[PDB]
Structure 1
Amino acid sequence: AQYKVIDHAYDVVIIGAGGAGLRAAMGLGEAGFKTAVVTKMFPTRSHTTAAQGGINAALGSMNPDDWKWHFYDTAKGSDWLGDQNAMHYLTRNAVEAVTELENFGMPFSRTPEGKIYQRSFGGQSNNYGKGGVAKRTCCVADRTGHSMLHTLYGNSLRCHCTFFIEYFALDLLMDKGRCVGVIALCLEDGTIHRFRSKRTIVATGGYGRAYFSCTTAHMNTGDGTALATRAGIALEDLEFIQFHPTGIYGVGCLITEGSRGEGGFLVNSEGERFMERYAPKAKDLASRDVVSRAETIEIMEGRGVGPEKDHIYLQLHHLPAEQLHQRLPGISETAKIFAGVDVTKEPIPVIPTVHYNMGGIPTNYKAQVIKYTKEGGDKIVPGLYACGECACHSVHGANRLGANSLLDAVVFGRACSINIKEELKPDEKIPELPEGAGEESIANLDAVRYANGDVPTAELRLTMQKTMQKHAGVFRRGDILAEGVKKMMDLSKELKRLKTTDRSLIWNSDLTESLELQNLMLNATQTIVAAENRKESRGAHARDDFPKREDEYDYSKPIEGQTKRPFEKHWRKHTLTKQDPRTGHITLDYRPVIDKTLDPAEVDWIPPIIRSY
């Protein structure tokens, strides 16, 4: 049939209003640009609002602390797969970033003295890895992500940036390596929109919904990363899928690490803190990629708990109801609601769940999207930025440190602002749409609308999610993945036997079902192959058949006189998947990890070591 199309012309457009989305939105509005924020739900509904634990920063409102020790842990937890510059950026900016939010009016919990309250979290440690556990996470008791996100939204009105809400971003506006704007659908009345813009930010959160079980939203299908792929951008580190240790057994609701941070621990059928075995130092507060395995083992070996011997207990009843009600209000509730459990009397049934994606769209410390060749390094795609979860600066590398993400969404959002208020020529004007432009995105829609297939939008989604869980799991063997990639590639082929029912333009949910599948095929398929091709065991990634972490050297034994292994023999590299969407065919380059700081004079880089907790 036929469609209504509308044209908008904005300086900058932001795709998504999460934490990262809003922190940008307000930076530009503030310096006076004609922003537009496109999102597919009222901003307060973004997954950021479920965030619980906190945000990391060295204010030391509890005990002296240096932003340097935080940088340490970030690089450590990253299992040296992060870019050390980004990690540098992140960590000096973190004290401002947070306080900025206390000035914007966030009701952070408070120390008696009067300053921000802070709690301890998984992975972190004082004095460059030789002190006690650091208390570096700032938090609104248990509601930290929620409280923050309202605050940003609250302030997002103070600076006039036009919100296009309940709008679905279909694709980017591509002019041979130049991003001019976005195409989008308006749920409320079926009208298609085009957004001429000088600049474009993609900030759309992870793809946690690729799996059967996840701690994420129903809305978290990583359609950002879909846009880069269909714009011909290479995606990176899609094999680094964090599993969060304390998912709630039945549903997949998260129980914040902050509960371990505050004292409560893990227990197996035997009635034993098994973390004393797997992490003699950090105990129940190691990094999550470790802890998640500790559980996945315990279970595999029949020390699991319940009537199914297949999850474990998180125990907190040994703690004062005072501290519990006050430092952990929200979890106390969700415990009671979904598990039917009182944290003062019993333990909670918990089980590692797919949580965060350290993968995403490739960028520098300046948060600008980049293509890459061996031939001439990394060519920046101008007009285009990315931040948050859909981003990959690689401040996380192979394993994300906990409560560094709200951080990296505040900071690299804020970087998106500062680094456009820096290089925008108040001279030259808004990019033009090519003739007949956008027309291919809509074309997809059309056939997806009237799609007379024979497998339903929903049955497909399910099967893929089951097959992702079985294969791209916590522990991955070689012949599993290869058999995975097998099935999976049949599925990214099943998309032409697709059945749909609601033919309507207006609030067609069956149809944003379908687009949101399409956009998760491209995720999952790239996720799984990249996983398969990696023959090492670093962070989120673990192989049954390659237990060792392959670097240039072998940093187990002193360096003196060893021979540097060639770039192709080792695996300290970012995986870069391309896929052509027509075919759905994945081919894999490999970018080098960036190992240098931003100011050698201010801080010294950290050379790879053995990963001990």
Structure 2
Amino acid sequence: PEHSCDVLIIGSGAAGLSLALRLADQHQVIVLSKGPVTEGSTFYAQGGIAAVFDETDSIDSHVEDTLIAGAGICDRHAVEFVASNARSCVQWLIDQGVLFDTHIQPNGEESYHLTREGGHSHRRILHAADATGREVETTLVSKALNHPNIRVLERTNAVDLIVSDKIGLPGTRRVVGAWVWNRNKETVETCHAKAVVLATGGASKVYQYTTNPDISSGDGIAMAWRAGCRVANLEFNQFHPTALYHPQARNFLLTEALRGEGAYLKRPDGTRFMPDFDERGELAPRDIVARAIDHEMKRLGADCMFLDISHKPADFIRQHFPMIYEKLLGLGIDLTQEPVPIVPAAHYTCGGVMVDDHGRTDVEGLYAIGEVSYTGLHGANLMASNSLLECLVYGWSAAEDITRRMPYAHDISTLPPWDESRVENPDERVVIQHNWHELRLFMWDYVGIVRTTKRLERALRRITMLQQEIDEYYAHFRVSNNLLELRNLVQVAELIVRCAMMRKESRGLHFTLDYPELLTHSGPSILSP
């Protein structure tokens, strides 16, 4: 028909492309990508992927580090599980063409050089200079493009998934495709499939400041919800503690790896502030550091803080942080000689769509893996470099489950075409622009790093106004990117806030002045549609 395949993968970053390869030798796969095929967080990951490779290190530490960085609510099977398959998955990646920095020199022979970021307690982060992402994305991309059974559809923005009991199909609720805005030809076309996989990324763009590409609008979280999936833990959004505070800093992240190799966190006056907050100093986990930086900006009334690796050999630095060095230089900053100004910005969505060990969601035929998901691995706070890591493990387990299921799968039926609504309004379009800004601004102030019930009230009320306001002014409006994206950001913002109002405690990334203490029995926050 319009478009047909066996497995439709929505998203083409680490989660999707990698899942796509595993499926390719025996399935017909179509990977969508809302912008160019490589635009996505993955392409921008710097510091690398955690796995366990050193004789000295052990799966045990990597788990325990994760259970700690997760502030008590990581789900254990989930952490071990995943702790227990990296390299293999990491190895798989390598067997695909990925080149991680080789050492040269244990004191006998060559290996994979390894960094560390906060919460780690052994060195096990494979990287490629200070720009792992480019190497992974670039490669999975190239493999998927040169494979007969995977069709890559760029500039294709999914709008919603097709659920059988919603289009009068009979049988249990299950996904059977998605309607997609074909950016280039400006229609919504229909894509049929036997399995749909959400690999869309996260949502940090709901926040005014973020380390993210402009794609990270939470679309798949929203799609899944509109389709019936429960979602969880969306109050746990991570604000990476060191993003560049420079006017031309579109949105840039200085890797945690910097701290991992000696970088320092300083006050505008030169002093190191972390030890006022946590023995773990520069390498404590992110909810705690981000909070400290936030605390100090407020107390001091300062625009910012600084990241300094000067104390270190120009050469070390330039060989281990090429990309960041090349690029702070264009902004007339010398990572080699000066402290860089940095601020905490929205970086990763710890929560998302509930899914089990094979990436399955609550709706048959619908999977989700990667940042768009919630597995239990990150509890209340991700540990650095577990993210790409989750993307890979779940692309595997999911490939396995699907593969086993495809042979018994129902035959690809015809579907209703999307009802292109078609009204226009040059001015109201602009308004859709005001609202996006509006949202991102109030979520920063009202569902940010420090929180209170009363601010969460303000946030929900404003989101409610936005949704009422949207049904009313943009239910008949012709599809477009901005409108698609705004419906999604607003939807996801609701789940975030509602999840945040449920937690009567301060844990991991959720900190609220009205409950500074810990409950003794916690768990995830769960919302169902």
Give the TM-score taking structure 1 as reference length.
Answer: 0.80
Partner of 2:470 in structure 1?
A: 495
1:45 counterpart SS class: coil
Structure 1 counterpart of 2:282: 284
CA contact (8 A) 2:6 2:195 kept: yes
Q: Is 1:51 matched with 2:45?
A: yes
Question: Does the Cα contact within 8 Å between 2:277 and 2:292 map onto a contact in 1?
Answer: yes
Number of the residue aligned with 2:170: none
Alignment partner, residue 36 of structure 2: 42
Cα deviation, residue 499, structure 1 = 7.9
**Cα deviation code 1:198-233 (max 9, x no counterpart):** 111010001111111100011111111121122122
The aligned counterpart of 1:464 is 439
Pairing 1:411-430 to 2, within 5 Å after superposition: 411-424=393-406, 426-430=407-411
- Once the 2 structures are TM-superposed, how far is the Cα of residue 335 of structure 1 from its aligned partner? 2.1
**Paired amino acid for 1:430:** D
1:229 matched to 2:225? The reply is yes
1:410 positional shift: 1.3
Deviation at 1:498, TM superposition (A): 4.4
- C-alpha root-mean-square deviation of aligned residues, in Å? 2.2
- How far off is 1:535 after superposition? 1.2
- Tell me what 1:548 maps to: 517
Which one of the candidate residues 188, 191, 205 is aligned to 1:195?
Answer: 191
1:141, distance to aligned residue in structure 2 (A): 1.1
CA contact (8 A) 2:194 2:409 kept: no
Q: Give distance in 1, aligned partners of 2:385 and 2:207.
A: 22
Task: Indicate if the aligned counterparts of 1:15 and 1:204 stay in contact, CA closer than 8 A.
Answer: yes
SS of structure 1 residue aligned to 2:254: coil
Structure 1 residue runs without a partner (length 5+):
1-5, 126-133, 371-380, 506-510, 553-571, 580-613
Deviation readout 1:428-463 (Å, 9 max, x if unpaired): 5424245xx354xx45x545x568748611111111
Distance in 2 of aligned mates of 1:519 and 1:428: 31
**Distance across 1 between alignment mates of 2:321 and 2:429:** 48
Partner of 1:576: 526
Q: Once superposed, which parts of structure 1, at least 4 consecutive aligned residues long, lie more than 4 Å away?
A: 449-455, 496-500
- CA deviations over 1:462-485 (Å, ceiling 9, x no partner): 111111111111000221211222
**Aligned partner letter, 1:26:** L
Equivalent of 2:20, from 22, 25, 47? 25
Residue 427 of structure 1: how far off its partner (Å): 4.7
CA shift for structure 1 position 349: 0.5
1:167-206 equivalence runs, <5 A = 167-176=156-165, 177-206=173-202
* 1:133-212 superposed matches below 5 A: 134-160=122-148, 161-176=150-165, 177-212=173-208
Distance 1:410 1:428, change over 3 A: closer
Letter in 1 for 2:19: A
- Cα distance in 2, alignment partners of residues 530 and 187 from structure 1: 33
- Secondary structure of the 1:194 match is strand
Aligned mates of 1:529, 1:382 — CA distance in 2:
25
Does 2:280 match 1:258? no
Q: TM-score, normalising length from structure 2?
A: 0.92
* 1:353 CA drift (Å): 0.8
Contact 1:451-1:498 at 8 Å conserved across structures = no
Structure 2 contact 145–152 (Cα < 8 Å) conserved: no
SS of residue paired to 2:272 = coil
Amino acid across the alignment from 2:354: P
For 2:361 and 2:118, locate their aligned partners in 1 and report how far apart those are by CA, in whole Å.
Answer: 30
Match of 1:531 among 490, 497, 500: 500
Q: 2:75 aligns with which of 73, 79, 83?
A: 83
Partner residue, 1:475: 450
Distance 1:498-1:247 versus aligned 2 partners, 3 A rule:
farther
Deviations 1:362-410 (A, max 9, x none): 001121002xxxxxxxxxx221100111111121111011011111111
**Cα distance, 1:325 vs structure 2:** 0.8
Q: Distance in 1 between matches of 2:408 and 2:446?
A: 53
Partner of residue 399, structure 1:
381
Query: Which aligned pairs between 1:211-610 and structure 2 lie closer than 5 A?
Result: 211-250=207-246, 251=249, 252-280=251-279, 282-302=280-300, 309-338=302-331, 340-370=332-362, 381-424=363-406, 426-433=407-414, 437=416, 439=418, 442-443=419-420, 446=422, 453=428, 456-496=431-471, 498=473, 511-552=480-521, 572-578=522-528
Find the residue that maps to 2:245 and give its secondary structure. coil
CA distance in 2, matches of 1:427, 1:243: 44
Q: Does the C-alpha gap of structure 1 residues 452 and 576 become closer, same or farther in structure 2, counting only changes over 3 Å?
A: farther
Could you tell me how far 1:277 is from its partner in structure 2? 2.6
Amino acid at match of 1:468: M
Q: 1:33 offset after TM fit, Å?
A: 0.6
Shifted more, 528-537 versus 268-277: the winner is 268-277
DSSP 3-state at the match of 1:543 = coil
Instruction: Report the CA distance between 1:8 and its aligned residue.
Output: 2.3
Give identity over the alignment, percent. 31
Flag the structure with larger Rg: 1
Structure 1 residues 538-577: Cα deviation after superposition (integer angstroms, max 9, x where no partner): 111101121112122xxxxxxxxxxxxxxxxxxx122222
Aligned length: 514
| In structure 2, C-alpha distance between the alignment counterparts of 1:33 and 1:80, rounded to whole Å | 40
